[PDB]
Design a protein around this ligand. Structure first.
Ligand SMILES: CO[C@H]1CCN(c2nccc(Nc3cc4c(cn3)nc([C@@H](C)O)n4[C@@H](C)C(F)(F)F)n2)C[C@H]1F
Length: 306
């Protein structure tokens, strides 16, 4: 197989400064911060993810496995790891996405999200996803919560906690136990623990549904145990009121039993692009930062020779 010549950057704790907490999960604390490299005269808005507090060797392998995947990606619609900090607790340093996750964004801005925006997000998620397919990467956790907003017009795929690299003549990934998101999972993933790029396509369909419903919970109320029995019977997520048969037919195609019958991410870019050219024909919607900001540079503009 092809050697992975990606560069993992080790950053000094002194190079960056924590401002406030963005999220305090059971896994850790994500901090809003600023990164001032060596003597570069730049301030890079960052998101610093530290592994809870305690140093357990079991979870350190998980954060470094996430660092491996995140350092091996480079696409405008995928979040790249800026570096790692080897302190008492391992810290992942990533680009600050000022508008947070897409799921919370669609819920918080329901009344100001237009058809042009929803369809553009779909194209963008399909572009980043097709890139991961080119990189032989299976996400295994694509959802609106794992799509971050850089600007309302620019979103990127993130959270490589479950991501796996295939390569050569490996077409599918076989999993173990662990907590897995059942409501975003393809049927072969629930029944056989088989993950492919086409299983990611199913998850893409559910992500699109979340967006088109403005952040509604898929199969709301239904326990994860019943999902498998529901999908096997032929039941799928409802048509969002704003969706024309055109958009819904795309979501439906992602949820077909035969994985190879589902659309490819390169076809989803094409389909949604045609739709983004005349967004009102496809979506029916009624009525459709405290420091010296002189040297602030976004991570997408801060590059080091590759
Ligand atoms: C479980 O860890 C996740 C957390 C989100 N990760 C991430 N990846 C790339 C960039 C990035 N930046 C990033 C993440 C941000 C953010 C600004 N920038 N603002 C928020 C809140 C206020 O809405 N979040 C969320 C997702 C949280 F706090 F939970 F992280 N964050 C990917 C993994 F590290």
């Amino acid at each position: 197989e092809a050697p992975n010549q990606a560069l993992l950057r080790i950053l000094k704790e002194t190079e960056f400064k924590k401002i406030k907490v963005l999220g305090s999960g059971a896994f850790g604390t994500v901090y809003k911060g600023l990164w001032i490299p060596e003597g570069e005269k730049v301030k890079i808005p960052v998101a610093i993810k530290e592994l809870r507090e305690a140093t357990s060797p079991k979870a350190n392998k998980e954060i470094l496995d996430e660092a491996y995947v995140m350092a091996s990606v480079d696409n405008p619609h995928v979040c790249r790891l800026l570096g790692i900090c080897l302190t008492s607790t391992v810290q992942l340093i990533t680009q600050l996405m000022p508008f947070g996750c897409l799921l919370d964004y669609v819920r918080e801005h329901k009344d100001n999200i237009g058809s042009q925006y929803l369809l553009n997000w779909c194209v963008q998620i399909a572009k980043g996803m097709n890139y991961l397919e080119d990189r032989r990467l299976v996400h295994r956790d694509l959802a609106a919560r794992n799509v971050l907003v850089k600007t309302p017009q620019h979103v990127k795929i993130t959270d490589f906690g479950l991501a796996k690299l295939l390569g050569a003549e490996e077409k599918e990934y076989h999993a173990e136990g662990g907590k897995v998101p059942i409501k975003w999972m393809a049927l072969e993933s629930i029944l056989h623990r088989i993950y492919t790029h086409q299983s990611d396509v199913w998850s893409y369909g559910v992500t699109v549904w979340e967006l088109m419903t403005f952040g509604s919970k898929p199969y709301d109320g239904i326990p994860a145990s019943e999902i498998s029995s529901i999908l096997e019977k032929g039941e799928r997520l409802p048509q969002p009121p704003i969706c024309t048969i055109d958009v819904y037919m795309i979501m439906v195609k992602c949820w077909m039993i035969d994985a190879d019958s589902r659309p490819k991410f390169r076809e989803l870019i094409i389909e949604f692009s045609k739709m983004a050219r005349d967004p009102q024909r496809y979506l029916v919607i009624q009525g459709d930062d405290e420091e010296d900001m002189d040297d602030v540079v976004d991570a997408d503009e801060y590059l080091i020779p590759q």
